[PDB]
Amino acid sequence: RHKILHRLLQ
Amino acid sequence: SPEQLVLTLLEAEPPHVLISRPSAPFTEASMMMSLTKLADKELVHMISWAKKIPGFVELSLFDQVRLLESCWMEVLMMGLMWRSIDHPGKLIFAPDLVLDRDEGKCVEGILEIFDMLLATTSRFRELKLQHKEYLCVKAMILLNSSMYPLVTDSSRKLAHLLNAVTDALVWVIAKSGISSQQQSMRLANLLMLLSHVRHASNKGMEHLLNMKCKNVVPVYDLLLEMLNA
Ligand SMILES: O=C(N1CCc2ccc(O)cc2C1)C(F)(F)F
């Protein structure tokens, strides 16, 4: 769902 | 604290994303391809930008995610307006993608949005928006979204941040030396423009959600993710 955003934040 | 906060925001500015007009005359499809390809790339760089604002990465993951989902189009637009401020009648999407207002006629529904973006840009131009006020205002846009409790001290940490950024903006405006009353009116004029940015944001979002429906443009990656909502 925020599969990519979570990725770029962490 | 205001000077350091302002320097941090200065140093946080994302790179300019380069893109060019296609070789062939624009169509509705190819114009939207260009603007969404640009938006997607600027989104990538927006995350790194947000992460450099002091305290941002100390908020909870949900809070970080939620402010970014809520403000990204506003931030894209605000960065666009800043680029365009000195160029009436044009939107400076990238050094090599400079659209004349009339070019928005190319895509159904996009002229209105260009017009809103252009009018807000003229209001910033008439107010003589300074670089440092733009830094504070753009950060305020990130930090100033509705949150209503989610079910998942982050929220007080958010308030402290926004506070500090609003302080920084007041501090920046104090530099001009103008009357106390004019300092209040300039603050008000700036913040009142936050509504216009949210309003153009809303029309931009709806435009792109509808385009994505019509398959008028395929959308990818981060941009598609952000839109999927
Ligand atoms: O797609 C649209 N835009 C408008 C704003 C904007 C700002 C920066 C950027 O890189 C791309 C875009 C694309 C919209 F008109 F809103 F649907």
Q: Comparing C-alpha atoms, which of B162, B190, B186, B208 is closest to residue B31? A: B208
DSSP 3-state of B81: helix
3-state secondary structure B91-155: EEEECEEEEEHHHHHHCCCHHHHHHHHHHHHHHHHHHCCCHHHHHHHHHHHHHCCCCCCCCCCHH
DSSP 3-state of B62: helix
Angle (deg, nearest 10), helices B110-127 and B61-84: 80
Residue-range definition of the domain harbouring residue B224: 1-229
Specify the residue with its C-alpha closest to ligand 1, atom 16.
Answer: B204
* Domain containing residue B119: CATH number: 1.10.565.10
Candidate from B48, B61, B225 with C-beta closest to A4: B225
DSSP 3-state of B19: coil
Nearest CA in chain B to A8: B47
Distance (Å) of CA B221 to CA A4, B74, B106, B150? 8, 19, 25, 26
Which residues on chain B are in Cβ contact (under 8 Å) with A1? 228
Long-range contacts of B191-199 (CB under 8 A, 24+ apart): B191/B140, B193/B120, B193/B123, B193/B124, B193/B137, B194/B137, B194/B140, B194/B141, B194/B144, B196/B116, B196/B119, B196/B120, B196/B123, B197/B74, B197/B77, B197/B78, B197/B81, B197/B120, B197/B141, B198/B74, B199/B116
Candidate from A1, A4, A10 with C-beta closest to B222: A4
The number of domains in chain B is: 1
Q: Comparing C-alpha atoms, which of B185, B171, B182 is closest to residue B2? A: B171
**Chain A nearest CA to B222, separation (Å):** 6
Contact B105, B112 (CB under 8 A): no
Which residues are CB-neighbours of B177 under 8 A, at least 6 positions away? none
Which residues are CB-neighbours of B204 under 8 A, at least 6 positions away? B73, B76, B77, B113
Which residues are CB-neighbours of B65 under 8 A, at least 6 positions away? A2, A5, A6, A9
Q: Comparing C-alpha atoms, which of B141, B131, B130, B200 is closest to residue B166? A: B141
Tell which of B59, B64, B71, B221 to mutate to test the A interface (max A CBs under 10 Å): B64
What residues form DSSP beta bridges with B94? B97
3-state secondary structure B152-189: CCHHHHHHHHHHHHHHHHHHHHHCCCCCHHHHHHHHHH
Which residues are CB-neighbours of B182 under 8 A, at least 6 positions away? none
C-alpha distance across the termini of chain B, in Å: 35
B221/A5 CB distance under 8 A: no
**Chain A nearest CA to B229, separation (Å):** 8
By what technique were these coordinates determined? X-ray
DSSP, res B20: B
A5 touches chain B (CB under 8 A): yes
Counting Cα atoms < 13 Å in the Cβ hemisphere of B105 gives 4
Tell me the two tokens of residue B130: 């300074």
A6/B69 CB distance under 8 A: no
Resolution in A: 2.0
Residues in chain B: 229
Tell me the two tokens of residue B188: 């008000």
Counting Cα atoms < 13 Å in the Cβ hemisphere of B43 gives 24
Counting Cα atoms < 13 Å in the Cβ hemisphere of B73 gives 24
